[PDB]
Symmetry: C4
């Protein structure tokens, strides 16, 4: 964590130069009662490229050593004229490296479209400070206090970069006019960048909700063209509502394919944990049979009142309840045998042989259950002859 | 619905404080002939966190009880000085909860990109009121009527937040200059948010139309490279036109997979309702045979004049007409036997055996019909031996 | 086409009212030497809801009959005061219907994102005219000419709706201040709409190019991680370049699935037209064999210098050249047997039996050829016993 | 490269006319000491449509010959009045062709969304020059120097097109007011275009990162609903972190399908180069067996500590290590037999027969290995009987 606390320190130094240099270029009466601080900052900025190396002349390393040799403490100490001392701003090249560090250490828990906006706003304010100092530099010599004429310059630059333009402070000289033109263009560019960043950030703020909305609209639009009843359309709408309320509309089978096989098996083993550990025919088997079965359970959701099994039909599947309730009724739907809930299973008689069903099965709410076929079971039983022999015994 | 009519009430109270507090901070002559109303609002705002609980110190519950204890009726009653009475605006924190409620009760029948825009516009106007009151507060003491100087302040704040900047009202004091700078930045930020929200809302307004347009452009671009006739390109274009006119370009097979199996079966059973309930060989069968067949019918669209069956060839399919018309012609296309329309079927002789066809079949318009193979029929007939035996009898 | 020439007429009438009404409300000296025109327009606007019916009280029909009864010719003829004659602008509701017509008759050959922008710009200019008339109405009575004070009003409204705000024309009265505030908000909203529409239009202007660029970047990014030679990366890059130059990067197999089966068969029959009509073993067969084969040819592209067939190996495929050239070399690549070009084929000996190859085959440029397997050929030959018998004879 | 150096020359000529023509229309005292240059430019611009032809009256060729005949050197030489000499700007139509060339020669190594922005900025500055000259033309006759009144005009046009509007330079005449209105509209349009282009460019700057972020958020959102342990969620998160760090989240199987078969085979042969060239049972085989095997190896990633093979189970696969390390332990995980690293393989005994495993295999870090089944091996061995016979010998 020492790296983190030293990066904050070098940031606090490059934002010390980024506020002191342009403001010293305008007021030379400074730089005397801040020399103990700029010596310290120069030391703490020159003894940082070794440490970075312990982690030359490269396309992404030139700023770090260009912003480290003391161009300052020389132009201010020797009192160089105006055109040649303006290279004292080479220390601000360190800001590039600072940004390049902050865009890769903090980019784990922050939206990449918001960190860019925060960096842009910080750069805009830090450039507005320099623009205010520049505007204040090329003004007629006056006797006003330093803070009043800094306030006027900052007011002018803020009213120019936001494209408001009150007009109470205007150029009065060719040089001021050229400066105003160039920084009018700069302000337009910066405001355009801000608007574009905000538009990008807002445009991608509700993705799952809009995807679910449009895939419901598409289904309803196609479904009305085929002239299907209002009742069944209402059932479909309420199913989509339940899907959005529970799992935000994500499809289980397309979600559980971005995982590699061992993680997918671990997830499946923690989901279908206890359910298959109590099935009367799978007992006596090893862990490889169970692990083979668990990967072939297929999910399906049944709404309220829907039929799962009809009494009399052949049937070949077996169902495991996960997150719902189920009722068992006779062939006439008049006598209720029992009620099954999470963790239990029904239909285990179909795997043994293809005898017709013996009772009717009705969903009481949204069931969210898993099912296993018979051909899949036969294929994955043809490899474990001892188990298949035992099943033949029970048959 | 009582919850809905009480949420509107608490909204009408938090927009009563949001208009009365900043305007009372400027004009102290108020708060005497509005005390019966603010007592009532304070009661109706303190007796709302129990009811919310009947539905503490949580990250999303702190505003509700911070905006409920009467910081008002104390600063105004005891006449606290300017810097310390400004915490009377804690009641405006209730606006967060109000927004958080309106974004989850009304988010069922409203585009999520439009509710955010409406909330943003409401917040912008409600903040412009407060900014106008703030600007009017730090002005020199004058004798003008209260409404004229409220009109001037509102005019200034509206001409600043829209980034127009006429310039007839400008700062004339350091404090006014600092206030103007900060709210120039606020106005730029708000206008950027508005533009970004509008851009996001507009960018996603024609999705199906643009998707259809680009998937037609891609087909034509690829299709010209292979040097294919203008006639067949015109046929493809008119097919895509018909598809867009009828079902907005949605593909039937990719649409009918977002449904679970029972809903998909219900949809198919209501689509292919009567058609298979009159087929001469499927009669005598149960409901499971029909329900098995219905899930294996495959859609296909035939344009005008196209050939569906050629006289003499082997053939193995059977076709059910859904939304079109069909004509039956002899081997020489000279004598018209009959005309079939919606609900009827042809080609049933191919399922029994592989004898060559007996007549030619021509589409009269866009047919939009369903078809069943023979290998699929054989696979799904190998499980119902009684039916297969009867088919063997008819063969 | 008479409908098209009459819709233009009703557009020219609703843009006659949309320019005459607000300008007459300000200058009452008009409406005398334009009565023969507004009578004609009223007739041509009342005798248009029957014709629309030949193509009441509906949610999308109320404007058509609200904008048809003569509220005009009554307020101007009886000289109604200012607050009550302002309902003369009900005729501008016809603009909604006009827009609703122009958005569905011209929406076939125009980008839907550009028609909306053109409509928005037209509405903005037509509203700016009315705003200028409104501003000119509530001004002090002056003696200036009508065109000079219309020019000043139009200048003010254009400098307000574009958010420029020069400030040389400003309010000077409470009513003018309220008007200015409301239309400052209107101008901000309109400029936001314009910017959002332009952003949407520009954001979707190069789709295929960006898709190809990103799918090349993804391939190269993954391909460098596996540490694969610069030569083969250059070959992949030049293959993608050739694909983009010829068919804009579109994949043949994913393109040729948006067509229904008869159109897909027609496309395939026009592509592989002559090639299979000269193959020595397929001769003597009917049209159904050819039509069955044509649907199972699979495309593949070979770059320059690549090997297609190695002398000595078993091999099972047959290749048809479509858009390239091929050379045939001996086992030592020293003696060049022959050169094949578009329309010819090689490898036909593999279908008869699985004898080893007899010569080497090299691509001379990007070949763009089609291939047929052997198992597919065997499956689709097992249904036509006469042909399979003849092949057995040649074997 | 001569074409490249001549296109730069014609660009430097069309940006010579684009700066000289409007500035000469205002100051007639020019055009005498620049005739040797405009004669040269006219020659170098008329002798460029033959060379373009060596690479008429076409929809995309009309500018090239409209901007080549000397409308200049005639209006300036004969001193034509103001309304008729304004067609001297036909030479600026050459800018269209120049842009149309620069958008297709430099569009290989530049983002298409950035070249458009650079072209737009260049056009905006070049139009601002002309707008400044136009504004300076219709001003009262003054005695000021030419550069001061060019500076004022450029200042006015820049403060108008950026929508700032200081207001210190304003119209003072009907013609100036009309000019100001039209170019206020132009400036609003240009600023809207700039903002839209910037928004489009920024909106698509982090695609892979956002895709990875959202596909991790979807997995975690679905994964919490099933109530799965924090440990396994942490394992999934760290797996996704490793995937992003190594290959930017790209899936190997969906990446390696955009290549044609020969390039895919070349890539696979360079990846699995040495590994299969040392396998004890595959030795003695030819190149076609290896080339057949290499296309059926399937990738899989194992995290640290995960189990790859359990001692005692049947097993049927064989694994090749690519970019990781593996340890071999006994049945009790107490004695470490050996350590395998990149280039080696384990599990080769399962292909010979289905005997149970003999040792446990544990990942030490993220392994990134390839695996081969047994049924696939059996299918692709049933075609090479000599190899299958040798395997039967070793079995
Ligand atoms: C978001 C929240 C942001 C808050 C920023 C607050 C900045 C506070 C700056 C100071 C605010 C302040 O009240 O001080 C003023 C003096 O400023 C001065 O002369 C000092 C001159 C320098 C002021 C600094 C300029 C940059 C301010 C940019 C602010 C926005 C940044 C975002 C007036 O006081 P005072 O009556 O004594 O006047 C002296 C006499 O001549 C007139 O009475
Ligand atoms: C969308 C539609 C929106 C409509 C808003 C209408 C707001 C109506 C506000 C009042 C409109 C109005 O006509 O009243 C004015 C008075 O305002 C006054 O002094 C009252 C002062 C307070 C005005 C309220 C300020 C906020 C207005 C923000 C409006 C936009 C909001 C969106 C002039 O009358 P009056 O000749 O008697 O002048 C008195 C004498 O001194 C000059 O003749
Ligand atoms: C894109 C291309 C667009 C071109 C628009 C051209 C509009 C032409 C309008 C007229 C242009 C014009 O030159 O006419 C002016 C007169 O305007 C007048 O008073 C007539 C007053 C009404 C002018 C119309 C106002 C709307 C103009 C909105 C234009 C942009 C629309 C986009 C000056 O002439 P004139 O020396 O005789 O002055 C009289 C004396 O008092 C001063 O010399
Ligand atoms: C990004 C970087 C961009 C840099 C642009 C620099 C442009 C340099 C232009 C000239 C800059 C300059 O300092 O020259 C000025 C003169 O301008 C003049 O009269 C010359 C008049 C023509 C100036 C050119 C106008 C377009 C400038 C558009 C610039 C932004 C373009 C982006 C003042 O000097 P000087 O004290 O002698 O005044 C004479 C006396 O009357 C007052 O002292
Ligand atoms: N009395 C009962 N209590 C609970 N479940 C039952 C009862 N009778 C039948 N079932 C279940 O209902 C199923 C319907 O027929 P199956 O042959 O699929 O197997 C049956 C059992 O799983
Ligand atoms: N006279 C007829 N009227 C209606 N349909 C017919 C007639 N003759 C043949 N068909 C249908 O046309 C089909 C063409 O040959 P099939 O063997 O497919 O079965 C035939 C019947 O379905
Ligand atoms: N002399 C030749 N001229 C043209 N093509 C040939 C010649 N010899 C062989 N081929 C083709 O090259 C193929 C290579 O071996 P096949 O058995 O696939 O069948 C061969 C023919 O199609
Ligand atoms: N002593 C050993 N050193 C290295 N690898 C081994 C050793 N013993 C077994 N293995 C490998 O571990 C595998 C586990 O059982 P298999 O039958 O798959 O084949 C085995 C060999 O590939």
């Amino acid at each position: 964590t020492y790296t983190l606390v030293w990066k904050v320190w070098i940031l606090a130094v490059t934002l010390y130069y980024a506020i002191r240099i342009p403001l010293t270029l305008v007021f030379p009466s400074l730089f005397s009662p801040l020399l103990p601080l700029d010596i310290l900052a120069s030391l703490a900025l020159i003894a940082d490229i070794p440490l970075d190396l312990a982690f030359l002349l490269a396309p992404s390393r030139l700023p770090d050593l260009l912003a480290a040799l003391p161009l300052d403490l020389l132009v201010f100490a020797l009192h160089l004229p105006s055109p040649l001392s303006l290279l004292s701003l080479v220390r601000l090249l360190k800001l590039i490296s600072v940004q390049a560090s902050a865009t890769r250490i903090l980019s784990y828990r922050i939206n990449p479209a918001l960190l860019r906006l925060l960096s842009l706003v910080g750069f805009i304010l830090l450039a507005a400070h320099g623009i205010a100092c520049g505007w204040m530099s090329l003004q007629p010599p006056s006797e006003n206090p330093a803070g009043t004429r800094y306030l006027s310059a900052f007011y002018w630059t803020i009213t120019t970069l936001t494209t408001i333009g009150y007009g109470d402070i205007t150029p009065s000289t060719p040089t001021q006019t050229v400066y105003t033109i160039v920084i009018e263009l700069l302000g337009a560019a910066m405001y355009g960048l801000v608007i574009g960043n905000i538009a990008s950030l807002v445009s991608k703020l509700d993705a799952a909700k809009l995807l679910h909305r449009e895939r419901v609209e598409r289904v309803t639009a196609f479904l009305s063209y085929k002239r299907i009843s209002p009742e069944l359309q209402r059932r479909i709408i309420e199913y989509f509502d339940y899907l959005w309320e529970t799992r935000r509309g994500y499809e289980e089978r397309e979600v559980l394919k971005e995982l590699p096989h061992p993680l997918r098996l671990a997830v499946a083993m923690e989901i279908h944990g206890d359910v298959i550990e109590k099935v009367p025919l799978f007992k006596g088997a090893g862990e490889e049979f169970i692990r083979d079965i668990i990967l072939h359970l297929e999910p399906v959701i049944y709404g309220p009142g829907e039929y799962i099994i009809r009494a009399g039909e052949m049937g070949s599947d077996v169902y495991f309840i996960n997150r719902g309730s189920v009722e068992v009724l006779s062939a006439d739907e008049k006598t209720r045998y029992a009620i099954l809930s999470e963790g239990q299973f029904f239909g285990e008689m179909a795997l043994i042989l293809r005898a017709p069903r013996t009772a009717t099965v009705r969903a009481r709410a949204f069931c969210d259950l898993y099912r296993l076929d018979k051909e899949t079971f036969d294929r994955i039983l043809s490899r474990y002859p001892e188990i298949a022999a035992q099943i033949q015994e029970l048959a």
